[PDB]
Amino acid sequence: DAVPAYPFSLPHALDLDPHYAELRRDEPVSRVRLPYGEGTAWLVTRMSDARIVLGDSRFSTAAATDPATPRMFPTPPEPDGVLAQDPPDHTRLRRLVGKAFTARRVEEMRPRVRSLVDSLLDDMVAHGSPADLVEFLAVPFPVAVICELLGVPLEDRDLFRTFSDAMLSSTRLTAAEIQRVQQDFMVYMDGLVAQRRDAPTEDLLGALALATDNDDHLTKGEIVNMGVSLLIAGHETSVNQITNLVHLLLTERKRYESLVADPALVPAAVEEMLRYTPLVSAGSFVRVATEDVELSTVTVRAGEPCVVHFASANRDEEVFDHADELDFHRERNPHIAFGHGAHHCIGAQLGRLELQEALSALVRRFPTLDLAEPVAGLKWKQGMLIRGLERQIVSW
Numbered sequence: 559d560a561v562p563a564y565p566f567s568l569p570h571a572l573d574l575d576p577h578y579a580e581l582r583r584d585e586p587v588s589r590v591r592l593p594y595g596e597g598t599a600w601l602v603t604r605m606s607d608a609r610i611v612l613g614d615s616r617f618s619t620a621a622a623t624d625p626a627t628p629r630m631f632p633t634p635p636e637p638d639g640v641l642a643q644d645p646p647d648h649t650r651l652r653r654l655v656g657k658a659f660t661a662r663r664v665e666e667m668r669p670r671v672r673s674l675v676d677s678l679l680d681d682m683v684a685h686g687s688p689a690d691l692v693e694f695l696a697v698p699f700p701v702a703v704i705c706e707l708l709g710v711p712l713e714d715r716d717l718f719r720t721f722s723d724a725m726l727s728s729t730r731l732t733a734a735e736i737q738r739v740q741q742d743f744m745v746y747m748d749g750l751v752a753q754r755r756d757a758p759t760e761d762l763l764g765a766l767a768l769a770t771d772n773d774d775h776l777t778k779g780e781i782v783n784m785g786v787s788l789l790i791a792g793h794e795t796s797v798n799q800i801t802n803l804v805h806l807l808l809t810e811r812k813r814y815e816s817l818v819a820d821p822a823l824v825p826a827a828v829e830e831m832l833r834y835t836p837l838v839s840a841g842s843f844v845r846v847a848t849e850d851v852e853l854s855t856v857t858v859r860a861g862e863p864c865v866v867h868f869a870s871a872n873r874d875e876e877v878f879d880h881a882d883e884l885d886f887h888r889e890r891n892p893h894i895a896f897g898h899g900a901h902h903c904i905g906a907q908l909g910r911l912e913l914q915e916a917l918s919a920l921v922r923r924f925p926t927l928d929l930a931e932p933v934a935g936l937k938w939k940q941g942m943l944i945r946g947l948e949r950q951i952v953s954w
């Protein structure tokens with residue numbers, strides 16, 4: 559056809575396809591064909607344009623549920639998904655659980671979360687060096703935190719992890735395989751929610767069960783799906799981002815030594831690595847203009863779809879200086895690693911807390927930590943909408 563395939567290439571590690579800098583400079587809004595649905599989408603590569611697609615009510619995610627709309631992933635979007643809701647319906651859906659995820663409430667978790675880290679790092683010191691940081695820290699830490707927050711049984715880890723990996727599929731699985739898991743995950747979350755019917759609990763699944771027996775704006779579908787979205791995101795983002803930040807730290811070891819030297823740098827370093835790291839391997843959930851909307855180089859017509867690349871917006875040279883370098887001493891870091899606008903990540907403060915406390919703990923107690931398996935052999939996850947390591951053997 560006329561228009562280039564997107565994604566532009568099979569990803570390697572955390573590397574960014576070089577065409578994104580080319581486009582930011584010469585063609586910052588460009589037509590692409592996504593791997594699923596029909597027609598073309600505008601790919602948005604710059605920060606200013608990304609804030610408009612993500613930030614403006616003239617862009618609808620609900621409109622992108624149509625099986626014909628371009629998308630990054632095999633199945634048409636679940637219409638009951640938060641991501642697929644427009645305000646004000648979306649605002650009402652987010653209030654269901656927003657209370658738990660305000661920065662004040664998430665800060666209240668820091669002591670429990672720091673305990674959970676320390677304990678898991680004891681178990682890793684017991685085993686002895688070398689060990690797999692995935693098995694010992696990256697998987698168990700976020701999984702325990704989201705299980706205790708939602709009230710999901712921790713022994714269900716293998717079950718919900720298998721479900722979440724399938725649903726984060728890009729090319730790994732087929733539409734039918736994914737569609738099947740969506741059905742099972744919904745029927746599973748439905749069951750946990752129903753156990754609260756004559757046994758309410760002090761946790762988020764508890765709040766979802768109350769909204770089911772008493773609410774009128776929100777369907778049972780929308781409420782349970784919120785449980786699915788929180789359990790997937792709540793472990794998958796963090797499990798992958800711990801390995802991504804540890805990868806970035808140990809492959810240029812001075813990064814790691816610079817936090818060993820000043821542990822109090824860890825928060826700014828987390829923000830900078832959030833900027834730098836393509837957690838979302840390519841593209842985004844799609845937005846469809848409901849009216850003509852002016853971007854930097856082009857006016858998108860009502861009914862035309864747009865996709866953002868978050869990591870490309872976060873490499874924008876008009877916003878960050880030496881944008882292609884990791885710098886923990888940056889004075890200004892207005893990244894959209896957590897998106898922007900109405901769908902801005904609800905868990906952003908939990909993700910921040912988990913990355914701070916994982917890395918602070920490692921940097922303090924394990925000043926000798928190195929990668930103890932070769933770079934060339936690193937097992938990057940393939941065929942998923944997000945990036946991370948299956949294993950990260952380390953020594954201290």
Ligand code: HEM
Pocket residue numbers: 640641642652787788791792793795796799837842843868894895896897898900901902903904905906908909910
């Ligand atoms: C480093 C950790 C994380 C990163 C980098 C991340 C990134 C993102 C981004 C970029 C979005 C916006 C997608 C868009 O509008 O197209 C998002 C949305 C979301 N994230 Fe996060 N996330 C992280 C952690 C978490 C955590 C811990 C949770 C839940 C506990 C979570 C739950 C969600 C949910 C439910 C949405 C959809 C929100 C909505 O549509 O209103 N995320 N995340």
Ligand SMILES: C[C@@H]1[C@@H](O)[C@@H](C)C[C@H](C)C(=O)[C@H](C)[C@@H](O)[C@@H](C)[C@@H](C)OC(=O)[C@H](C)[C@H]1O
Pocket residue numbers: 630631639641725726786787790791795838841842843943944
């Ligand atoms: C399965 C996820 C869903 O759980 C969301 C809420 C979790 C995460 C944290 C997201 O919101 C995530 C950033 C997604 O928007 C993208 C990876 C997108 C391309 O993938 C998606 O849109 C996929 C298909 C979503 O449905």
Ligand SMILES: C[C@@H]1O[C@@H](O)[C@H](O)[C@H](O)[C@H]1O
Pocket residue numbers: 631632633634635636639724725726727736740
């Ligand atoms: C189609 C898309 O992909 C599946 O992983 C997830 O079930 C997500 O919830 C859905 O909207």
Ligand code: NA
Pocket residue numbers: 622628629630635842843844
């Ligand atoms: Na989409």
